[PDB]
Amino acid sequence: MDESFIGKSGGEIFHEMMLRQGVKHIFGYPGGAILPVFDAIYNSKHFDFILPRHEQGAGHMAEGYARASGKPGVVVVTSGPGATNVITPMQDALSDGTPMVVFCGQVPTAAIADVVGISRACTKWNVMVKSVAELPRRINEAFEIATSGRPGPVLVDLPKDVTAGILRRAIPELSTQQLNASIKRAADLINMGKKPVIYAGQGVIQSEGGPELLKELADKASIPVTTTLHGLGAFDELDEKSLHMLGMHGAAYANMAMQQADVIIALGSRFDDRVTGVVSKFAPAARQAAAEGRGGIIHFEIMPKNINKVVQATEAVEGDVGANMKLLIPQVKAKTMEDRKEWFDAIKGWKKKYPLSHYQRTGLIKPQTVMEEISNLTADRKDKTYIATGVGQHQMWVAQHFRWRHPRSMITSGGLGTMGYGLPAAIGAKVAQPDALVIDVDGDASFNMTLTELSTAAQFNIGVKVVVLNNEEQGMVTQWQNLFYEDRYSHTHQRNPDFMKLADAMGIQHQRVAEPDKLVDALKWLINTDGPALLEVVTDKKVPVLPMVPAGSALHEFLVFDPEKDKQRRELMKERTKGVH
Amino acid sequence: MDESFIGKSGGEIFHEMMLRQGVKHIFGYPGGAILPVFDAIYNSKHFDFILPRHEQGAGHMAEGYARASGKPGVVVVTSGPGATNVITPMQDALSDGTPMVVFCGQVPTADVVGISRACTKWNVMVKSVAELPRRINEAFEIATSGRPGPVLVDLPKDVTAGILRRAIPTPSAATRAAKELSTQQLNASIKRAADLINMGKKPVIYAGQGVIQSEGGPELLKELADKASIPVTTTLHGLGAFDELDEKSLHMLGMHGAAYANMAMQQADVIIALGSRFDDRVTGVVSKFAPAARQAAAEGRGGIIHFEIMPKNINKVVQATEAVEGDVGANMKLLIPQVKAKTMEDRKEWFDAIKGWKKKYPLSHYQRTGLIKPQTVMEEISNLTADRKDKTYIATGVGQHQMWVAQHFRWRHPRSMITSGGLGTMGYGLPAAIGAKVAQPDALVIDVDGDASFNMTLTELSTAAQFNIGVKVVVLNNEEQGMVTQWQNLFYEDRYSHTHQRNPDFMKLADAMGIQHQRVAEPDKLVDALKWLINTDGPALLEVVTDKKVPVLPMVPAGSALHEFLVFDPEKDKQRRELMKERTKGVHS
Ligand SMILES: Cc1cc2nc3c(=O)[nH]c(=O)nc-3n(C[C@H](O)[C@H](O)[C@H](O)COP(=O)(O)OP(=O)(O)OC[C@H]3O[C@@H](n4cnc5c(N)ncnc54)[C@H](O)[C@@H]3O)c2cc1C
Ligand SMILES: Cc1cc2nc3c(=O)[nH]c(=O)nc-3n(C[C@H](O)[C@H](O)[C@H](O)COP(=O)(O)OP(=O)(O)OC[C@H]3O[C@@H](n4cnc5c(N)ncnc54)[C@H](O)[C@@H]3O)c2cc1C
Ligand SMILES: Cc1ncc(Cn2c(C)c(CCOP(=O)(O)OP(=O)(O)O)sc2=O)c(N)n1
Ligand SMILES: Cc1ncc(Cn2c(C)c(CCOP(=O)(O)OP(=O)(O)O)sc2=O)c(N)n1
Ligand SMILES: [Mg+2]
Ligand SMILES: [Mg+2]
């Protein structure tokens, strides 16, 4: 029975609970209904408060802070438009399993925007706090739900009269057996397999000790490892067993491995549609091996309702992937590269047949090169380097041509795919990792969505580095329009603002590079700059992201780059567009 | 039976439905789920398409288009984040009754219709190509009828990529008897309303956005007020429904309304509420609202007459002595012949009390040094547009500047006020102005914007530049969230928690965006800068550096009754600034 809250207001109690929860940073924006909380946190020493230009920036900043730190991002906003503005961040956090706690002012309880109802389908949980006494309880509930199981966003409603009111009174197995049985069935299934593969996702990064255990099992039994977009960095991409990223824009060899493997080991990962291609043509070899009782698909998942949602698991290992790997690594029998000479020989053949470094290459900077060079210039510091991206081609290229070695280095919007996520998430990651190098690799359209937040980085002296790729197009959509609609480019081009005058207007140091010789010096300038800075890279237009497995394709039915296709495509487009492209 | 669509994709059907609906402009942003619609409208000649920087911008531009033109704003976005980014404009449109049809791409059959159910007037997911024309027509009909509002239409990719291969489809006595009976009830309630007015000795008209949204509404309002010599006050959204230069104008009422409007409302024996919903920021403390009118109802000599199109909305906030259901313009046509004419001389007592209040509490009485006063910016914009009020549209952000333009611009033209009132979304003004300018290409459209409001959506300046949409922007630069610092002064003893921001350089920003620009800080140069802005061609921005910590007055604070307002007092203002300077140790003067 607690009594250290009598005589304090709900805002003052809320201030105490942030301390008890270890909240060191809060992102938010005031308004009428949330004003009692802003009075309580006035000139606080418990945490730093970041005031953005827009609540959507507050929301994405909290996401990047969580992605970089594994701590929950915390947001405080007012009722009405304050809350509706954080819906895209919340839905985004929900889609990508990012822990977030969002507090909203509400009108007084007596007087009934339906913030709670509007947000049911876009949060992991939400609650309206109906009395000042409930306040420590709900706040604790909210923080644990947001971080338990699959982490997610939680919305807490703060009625003004609750936060302004004053507290007067004092306020308050045999499944394990079947788990071990499932672990044993999986080890048998791994050992039995001759063509195994690890398919690792963000669940590994979000489990304590996860990447290390990933390394162990993959080393001991010499199993090749591929990851999703969110799994990037859960395994050293320089390791010889690395297959890199699979899926819609994965490496053609990672796609080959998955399509021909007979034992697939799914760690984290929810088998998203941008990973599997058409699901009835996905993992044929592992599916036959399931039917021939000689292999299949193993799926380590912490959420019961996520299992067999998309693909049927041969054996399902329910619970924390890190803990369950500690009971599976024993029961797996070691192997060597020599053991799987035949398997790795096909893998290594695929790597030479389809290298990620085989893309058209002078005069106009190539966007893949920018990612190669950012990778090169930071190779000596990848344990202290974080990348935030927008959404589009640039997002895929940096997945492809950047070598991920550090877990949580990839800060990107995957499930929802929110353009504009990049810059705010970078700002939040750099608040989380002040002594790290945080780069926002951004396409100009994604960047045009939220570029008002440069002012947040200037006002607070947050040293993010921004690379804007300037191709004057919605690149990902032009690709699709070239592919499926014969170069009819419908509303996919924008006039950019002068990014150099813009960075100047915002109080951000800046340079612009357009000549491929000077590209590396420019990038070197950006990294070694002190305080926030922006580099504008003028790139080539109409550059496809390959490999791509398009809509309706199996996963092995990917397209890849051939210089005769690239010559032919651009000249068909030059004629269709009548010289404009 | 309609065969014209055989062989058409869902996208091409959509394209044709826009033509049949007479849509002339669409605001949107492509994505994967919606690509078949974009392929079908590629280089269309039937409407202009505005690509914004952010889908929130597309929505607010559609709002401003609708607000300036009375036509629905049409939005087209993709699934997931394309759809969640328009939730703020949709909730905004719902709260303010703005007709809007939002088309969202959807993956083949975010939870767009789940997350948007509570923030739309109606939503529908089209399930097959065959039903697309029927649903399109349903959406426009719902969006524009009754109280207008936003309607969300989910468009699954299989519906818009799919092909239609087949044709599709295009009064009793009991009904007739019931029809006559309901007409007689309406006519009865109109007579009673008329009788109530005729016995009133201190009548007042309380006019809202419903009058602007009704065909003939402002004309009929003027005829009524003229014939019976009734003074007219309006809400924030009703500004421009009545000529504020007429001797019968009480200007805006409510939390920041003219003191003479709030007095008149509190003394009136008959209140004629026309197309208004008695919002809490209008009535003050409801139980203390309109005491004179409530007493006159008790004694059978007056009360509150409410003209309202949504029958359900009557008696939800204030008890009506006489309700008149339906479209306020149609019912005023029937009301006016039954109201007996009165001269201003017949109402000498009433207008003399009002002239008293107007003399005692003039809106022009505010602190008037070397820093530009924000109130004075508004008065000068009103003076400088004296000859073109019929072609001038004002969009605003949310905050003090929004109250000041409501108070000191003299409103004369229906739909000239374009502002977010119900939800109160900061960032509305600039996109809404762009939308209004698209709707009225030959009108003067001005975005009067606070700096924090402007900072939310300033990226949309690139939209005005790319499409050469000549909006005029006035940014009031006080470096504060002025409305919140007024609340923090009032209730939290000058504890200014997180309500100050460093702006960007607005001249460098405007230049970066390709917008001609100017900055003004000296009171002697304000008029010429405003003259410069108003006479430019193409988009233009004027930054006005203003005084700080200026309270909006008059003010009915929370928990006070409508007649319990605070007014400007030069000595109280001096004490306030003195105490603020002490507590902030000279930081805020
Ligand atoms: C334009 C675009 C292109 C894309 N291209 C690709 C592509 O080519 N390839 C690709 O892979 N992705 C791609 N993505 C991203 C893709 O859509 C998904 O967001 C992503 O693949 C899913 O990542 P994940 O399954 O690893 O992690 P999540 O989606 O976060 O799910 C991880 C799973 O692990 C579980 N989990 C979490 N914590 C634990 C724990 N401690 N123990 C056990 N389980 C746990 C969760 O419940 C969840 O089911 C693209 C996105 C966009 C917008
Ligand atoms: C900080 C702030 C301060 C504010 N201060 C004030 C203030 O001092 N004073 C003020 O007035 N507002 C103020 N507002 C705005 C206020 O919150 C409301 O948005 C506004 O008062 C509502 O105006 P309305 O009733 O005219 O319009 P609406 O909210 O649109 O209501 C119109 C009503 O008319 C009905 N209607 C529509 N069409 C018709 C028709 N054809 N026939 C009949 N009925 C119809 C609708 O159903 C509805 O009931 C403020 C807002 C903010 C954010
Ligand atoms: C908020 C929002 N709106 C629309 C989309 C649809 N969309 C769009 C318009 C893409 C093109 C991104 O353009 P960019 O300039 O940011 O990057 P690239 O040129 O590298 O593709 S990618 C994509 O998914 C989206 N993901 N998010
Ligand atoms: C999107 C959003 N966030 C927060 C608020 C809360 N709020 C805030 C923060 C106001 C201050 C706006 O400051 P401004 O610079 O735009 O204008 P003034 O300085 O003239 O008040 S007014 C108001 O209602 C809001 N209405 N909308
Ligand atoms: Mg681009
Ligand atoms: Mg301001």
Domain boundaries, chain A: 10-164, 175-353, 367-545
Q: Are A105 and A160 spatial neighbours (Cβ–Cβ below 8 Å)?
A: yes
Cβ pairs A/B, distance under 8 A: 208
Contact A497 B514 (CB under 8 A): yes
Which residue type occupies A208? E
Residues A388 and A24 sit within 8 Å (Cβ to Cβ): no
Q: Provide the residues around ligand 5 (an ion) whose CB is within 5 A.
A: A 443-445, 471, 475
Kindly give, in sequence order, each residue whose CB lies less than 8 Å from that of residue A207, ignoring residues fewer than 6 positions away: A268, A302, A320, A321, A322, A323
List CB contacts of A310: < 8 A, sequence separation 6 or more.
A270, A271, A272, A273, A276, A279
Q: Does residue B341 contact residue B227 with C-beta atoms inside 8 Å?
A: yes
Distances (CA, A) of B109 to A15, B115, B131, B217: 45, 17, 15, 45
| Angle at alpha carbon of residue A20, lines to A19 and A22, rounded to 5° | 65
Q: State whether the beta carbon of B85 lies less than 6 angstroms from ligand 3.
A: yes
Amino acid identity, position A27: F
Beta bridge pairs of residue B73: B100
Q: Which of A428, A388, A426 is nearest to A50 (CA)?
A: A428
* Closest to A16 in 3D by CA, of A130, A140, A151, A153: A140
Q: Which of A581, A523, A561 is nearest to A361 (CA)?
A: A561
- The class (CATH top level) of B10-161 is alpha beta
User: Looking at the DSSP assignment, which residues form a beta bridge with residue A264?
Assistant: A197, A297
Distance CA A105, CA A31 (A): 8
The β-bridge partners of A465 are A439, A533
Place of tokens 């394990």: A176
Helix (H) or strand (E) segment spanning residue B520: strand B516-520
Contacts of B173 (CB under 8 A, 6+ apart): none
* Residue A470 Cα, gap to closest chain B Cα (Å): 15
Helix, strand, coil percentages, rounded to 5, for chain A? 45, 15, 40
Half-sphere exposure of residue B555, counting CA atoms within 13 Å on the CB side?
Answer: 18
Rounded distance between C-alpha atoms, residue A209 and residue A531, angstroms? 33
- Per DSSP, helices labelled H in A306-388 are 321-331, 341-353, 367-377
Out of B121, B235, B239, mutate this one to test ligand 2's pocket (max ligand atoms within 8 Å of CB): namely B235
Judged by CB atoms closer than 8 Å, whether chains meet at B506 and A505 is answered as yes
CA distance A527 to A464: 10
For domain A367-545, give the fold.
Rossmann fold (3.40.50)
Helices and strands counted in chain A (H then E): 25, 18
Q: How far is CA B583 from CA A43, A438, B143, B571, in A?
A: 14, 40, 52, 19
Tokens for B155?
């468009």
Q: Which of B72, B79, B114 is nearest to B93 (CA)?
A: B72
The CATH classification of domain B374-552, taken from the options 3.40.50.970, 1.10.150.120, 3.30.300.30, 3.30.160.270? 3.40.50.970
Structural element, H or E, at residue A274: helix A273-276
Q: Which two tokens stand for residue A358?
A: 């085989």
| Cβ contact B66:B100 at 8 Å | yes
Measured on CA atoms in the order B39, B41, B42, B48, is the torsion positive or negative? negative
Query: Residue B282 corresponds to which tokens in the numbers above?
Result: 């209008």
CA distances from B553 to A140, B290, B424, B573 (A): 42, 21, 19, 11
A224 near A156, Cβ under 8 Å?
A: no
Looking at the DSSP bridge assignments, the partners of residue A105 are A158
Determine which of A114, A157, A419 to mutate to test the interface with B (most B C-beta atoms within 10 Å). Answer: A419
Distance between CA atoms of residues A482 and A545, nearest Å:
12
Counting Cα atoms < 13 Å in the Cβ hemisphere of B398 gives: 19
Do the chains contact at B111 and A122, CB–CB below 8 Å?
Answer: yes
Exp. method: X-ray
Give the Cα separation of A427 and B2 in Å (integer). Answer: 55
What Rg do the C-alpha atoms of chain B give, in angstroms? 25
**Which residue does chain A place closest to B80, by CA atoms?**
A416
d(CA B327, CA A243): 68
Helix (H) or strand (E) holding A455: helix A454-460
As a whole number of angstroms, the distance between CA B378 and CA B174 comes to 58
Between CA A450 and CA A440 the distance in angstroms is: 12
Helix axis angle, B87-96 to B55-69, nearest 10°: 20
Do the Cβ atoms of B238 and B228 come closer than 8 Å? Answer: no
A331 alpha carbon, distance to own chain's centre:
32
Q: For residue A392, which atom of ligand 3 is closest to its CA?
A: 21
The count of C-alpha atoms lying within 13 angstroms of the C-alpha of A456, restricted to the half-sphere facing its C-beta, is 32
Superfamily of domain A175-353: TPP-binding domain (3.40.50.1220)
How far is it, in rounded angstroms, from Cα A114 to Cα A169? 30
CB A222 within 8 A of CB A340: yes
Q: What angle do CA B388, B389, B392 make, to 5 degrees?
A: 90
Between CA A341 and CA A345, with CA A342 as vertex, the angle to 5 degrees is 80
User: Quick one: fold of B173-360?
Assistant: Rossmann fold (3.40.50)
The region that residue B18 occupies, defined by phi over 0 for left and psi between -120 and 50 for alpha, beta otherwise, is alpha
Q: How far is A490 from chain B (nearest CA, A)?
A: 5
Question: Shortest CA distance to A262 belongs to which of A356, A342, A328?
Answer: A342
B254 φψ region: left (φ > 0), alpha (ψ -120 to 50), beta (else):
left
Q: Which of B42, B47, B88 to mutate to test the interface with A (most CBs of A within 10 A)?
A: B88
- CA-nearest of A581, A550, A539 to A483 is A550
Please give the CATH architecture assigned to the domain spanning A10-164.
3-Layer(aba) Sandwich (3.40)
Determine the residue of A38, A78, A79 to mutate for testing ligand 4's pocket, defined as the one with the most ligand atoms within 8 A of the Cβ atom. A78
Question: Reduced to 3 states, what is the DSSP secondary structure of residue B569?
Answer: coil
User: Alpha carbon B58 to chain centroid distance?
Assistant: 17
> Residue B77 Cα, ligand 3 centroid: separation in angstroms?
12
Evaluate: CB of B70 within 6 angstroms of ligand 2: no
Residue with tokens 């510091």: A381
Contact B512 A498 (CB under 8 A): yes
Q: How far apart (Å, rounded) are the C-alpha atoms in residues B555 and B407?
A: 12
Phi and psi for B289 in degrees, rounded to 5?
-80, 135
Q: Nearest CA to A317 among A303, A299, A331, A329? A: A299
Q: How far apart are CA A171 and CA A4, in angstroms?
A: 9
Asked if residue A116 lies in contact with residue A126, where contact means CB atoms within 8 angstroms, the answer is yes
CA distance B403 to B555: 10
Task: Name the 3-class secondary structure at B472.
Answer: strand
Nearest to A81 by CA among B480, B478, B477, B95: B95
Residues within a 6 A CB radius of ligand 1: A 96-97, 150, 201-203, 206-207, 228-231, 245-250, 268-270, 272, 274-275, 300-303, 306, 320-321, 391, 396, 414-415, 417
Contact B325, B313 (CB under 8 A): no
* Residue from A371, A394, A419 to probe ligand 3 pocket by mutation (most atoms less than 8 Å from CB): A419
Instruction: Give the integer Cα–Cα distance in Å for A254 and A222.
Output: 16
Distance separating alpha carbons of residues B469 and B476, to the nearest angstrom: 21
Select from A44, A58, A62, A136 the least CA-distant residue to A99: A62
Contact A32 B487 (CB under 8 A): yes
Give the whole-angstrom CA distance, residue B176 versus residue B78.
46
**What is the number of other CB atoms lying within 10 angstroms of the CB of residue B345?**
8
Residue A81 to residue A113: CA distance in whole angstroms: 8
Cβ neighbours for B447, distance < 8 A, ≥ 6 positions apart: B395, B396, B397, B429, B430, B432, B433, B471, B472, B473, B474
Ligand nearest to the CA of A397: 3
